[PDB]
Ligand binder design. Structure first.
Ligand SMILES: NC(=O)c1ccc[n+]([C@@H]2O[C@H](COP(=O)([O-])OP(=O)(O)OC[C@H]3O[C@@H](n4cnc5c(N)ncnc54)[C@H](O)[C@@H]3O)[C@@H](O)[C@H]2O)c1
Ligand SMILES: NC(=O)c1ccc[n+]([C@@H]2O[C@H](COP(=O)([O-])OP(=O)(O)OC[C@H]3O[C@@H](n4cnc5c(N)ncnc54)[C@H](O)[C@@H]3O)[C@@H](O)[C@H]2O)c1
Lengths: 365, 365
């Protein structure tokens, strides 16, 4: 069991990482400070891990009782109505401020569960058990929770930290290849924004990760968590630094909202968003040809898309980018690369013609 | 302009109190930190105050553009579906993280706008402009925001603190006697929980408050906000001490949900429920009978109910109380009077016979 910690003072919490951690009941029990637990998962994950997870919380612990809600599987259910099922279940069972929610699944569940937890009775303790690469390197950590609105991605939610995060890499064993690769998008992101040695290591080790080698995947998770924990501890609520985690995400969200929720996996949208934001960066003269080539090579190694869907138009991009949460006072700040690899800027001061070229170069219409 | 602070370090903020405050644009504009504002109000309040508040937000203020969203008026509407109207409007007009919400109304609007602000883009700034007594003396202060569920009161929300609170005493001039009176319930509450001298003051001053004397009303407000600000600063998230503000509110919330949201005013529900709490306190032999009948009498001078509605039952009270937020690991903790006037306890330890003796005394079935 490795531990990357997130230090937010009295609200600090541990990220436990290893194999078979779902068979170490002591880990979860330590963060369940009440009698009752509500596991939140979806229809795909539930048959695989729920019994295991209730097992890990109860069968060797007699004073803990566990309930579940199984929500439908899909990014397209990341909405207020599907979230209302969690509040409905919790109130039907008469759960109270001492209960604990447990997010069992990918990033869709983590985000929904975290926000529900933030809001139920004005907040109850919750724990993350990510079961995707995406969630294990990104979504489970940091306490950004919430839902999509039809006009945009993550527009309603809460900053709300879990009590712990339990990553067991065995759970990746049941994850389809496509879901695996899409999680690596965010791993590459850490490399580009602030982690050149991490990036470098990925250029060498991407075949391992794609072959799902345990040691590789475990380090990519660990090192991703180190980055994300550092940033969150410094900038929990995104005054400045935290926005760096949004490289390729202004575009990537435009791909998700535009291309209709769910068709492309998030990581697939980020893959393509990142290429676009690399291209803009070059066009602005802020980065080298070499970064462009290496960004393009590594995502190709991960069999992720390096351009957006051919139905995405320039107008859809602009219209969805208009509700990006990096807008301040009607001004669109972007995350762009600048200088040697591992360097990035959070800025609203970029030549808009460069942005316009990038859109027109990547869009068929 | 009388000020009363709320002390939460870097989240501290003033409550301004006085007449004609809506005629001092300076006060609102100080706390609007961006170019955009969305005034959330309702259809009763809008055509009386919206123009004026838009006028104050923009006078000598080119930098700021102001929009509004008009919600339906009623406790009935204090729920998630209606709140979607705030999000939908916000996103449609592309409001960003730097926008400010202005909650313009009674406590329904405050709680709703508060929780909408907490959640919009995971938190934007908001400001409180209470226009009912209930709001001016209680709900506007403390950053307890949220909404009802069918099965219970304020079971979804957040602890979110406003940028400031603008009590303009003139807004009470348009409020009906019934609404005004119902506000006085929380004024009394402060007396009984922690402020004996204030209580004694109200006993002299009740006829004055019911006649809308400017001085009495204003001092009630200041004293009511001082109490709450003191409690909120010490216990913002309700670890312990804050729960004391819920005297008679366990019973009260049960009346609201039991008898139908908005059939009685909150204040009216709270009055009856306070009277039940004192009865239970006496039955426990924790309280002298002078406190019982002193309470009964001040409420009657406010023309407030001292019984719950005739169709409330014992079962209804018990089933709604089971989802009170004062319940912890299945144990219902209550606010009860013990000792001289102005002293309180929050306890899980009481004889349950006292509890359903008081339930059977007040309910026809
Ligand atoms: N909150 C944050 O900071 C943050 C960071 C990154 C992403 N996110 C959000 O999280 C989501 C990321 O999506 P995701 O990749 O987690 O997708 P996801 O939650 O949809 O999961 C991917 C798919 O794999 C299935 N699945 C999950 N775990 C499995 C397992 N162990 N075995 C087999 N199948 C499994 C799921 O049912 C789903 O069909 C996005 O909505 C994104 O916006 C949030
Ligand atoms: N957040 C807190 O800490 C807190 C504290 C106490 C109460 N509350 C909540 O606040 C609510 C109590 O609301 P309320 O009693 O203010 O009622 P309310 O918000 O429903 O408004 C009272 C009625 O008077 C109308 N009105 C408001 N201002 C007016 C004015 N100036 N002139 C004419 N009419 C006006 C409203 O449109 C409504 O019809 C409850 O839902 C309660 O739970 C919250």
């Amino acid at each position: 069991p490795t531990i990357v910690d997130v230090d937010l003072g009295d609200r600090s919490y541990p990220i436990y990482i290893g194999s078979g951690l779902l068979d170490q009941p002591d880990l979860l029990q330590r963060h369940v400070h009440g009698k009752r637990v509500l596991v939140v998962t979806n229809s795909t994950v539930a048959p695989i891990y729920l019994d295991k997870v209730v097992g890990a919380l109860t069968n060797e612990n007699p004073n803990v009782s566990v309930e579940s809600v199984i929500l439908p599987d899909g990014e397209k259910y990341k909405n207020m109505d599907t979230l209302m099922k969690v509040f409905d279940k919790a109130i039907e069972s008469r759960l109270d401020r001492r209960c604990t929610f447990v997010a069992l699944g990918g990033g869709v569940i983590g985000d929904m569960c975290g926000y529900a937890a933030a809001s139920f009775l004005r907040g109850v303790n919750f724990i993350q058990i990510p079961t995707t690469v995406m969630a294990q390197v990104d979504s489970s950590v940091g306490g950004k929770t919430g839902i999509n609105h039809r006009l945009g991605k993550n527009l309603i939610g809460a900053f709300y930290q879990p009590q712990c995060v339990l990553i067991d890499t065995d759970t990746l064993n049941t994850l389809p290849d496509r879901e695996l690769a899409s999680g690596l998008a965010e791993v590459v992101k850490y490399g580009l924004i602030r982690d050149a040695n991490f990036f470098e290591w990925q250029e060498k080790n991407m075949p391992a990760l794609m072959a799902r080698d345990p040691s590789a995947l475990a380090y990519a998770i660990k090192r991703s968590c180190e980055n994300k924990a550092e940033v969150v501890s410094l900038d929990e609520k995104e005054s400045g630094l935290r926005a760096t985690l949004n490289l390729g995400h202004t575009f990537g969200h435009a791909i998700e909202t535009g291309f209709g929720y769910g068709q492309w996996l998030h990581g697939e949208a980020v893959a393509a968003g990142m290429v676009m934001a690399v291209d803009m960066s070059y066009r602005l003269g802020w980065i080298d040809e070499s970064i462009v080539n290496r960004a393009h090579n590594i995502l190709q190694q991960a069999k992720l898309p390096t351009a957006p869907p051919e139905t995405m138009t320039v107008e859809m991009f602009k219209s969805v980018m208009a509700v990006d949460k990096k807008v301040a006072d009607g001004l669109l700040r972007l995350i762009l690369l600048k200088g040697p690899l591992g360097n990035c800027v959070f800025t609203g001061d970029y030549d808009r013609k460069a942005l316009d070229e990038t859109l027109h170069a990547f869009c068929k219409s």
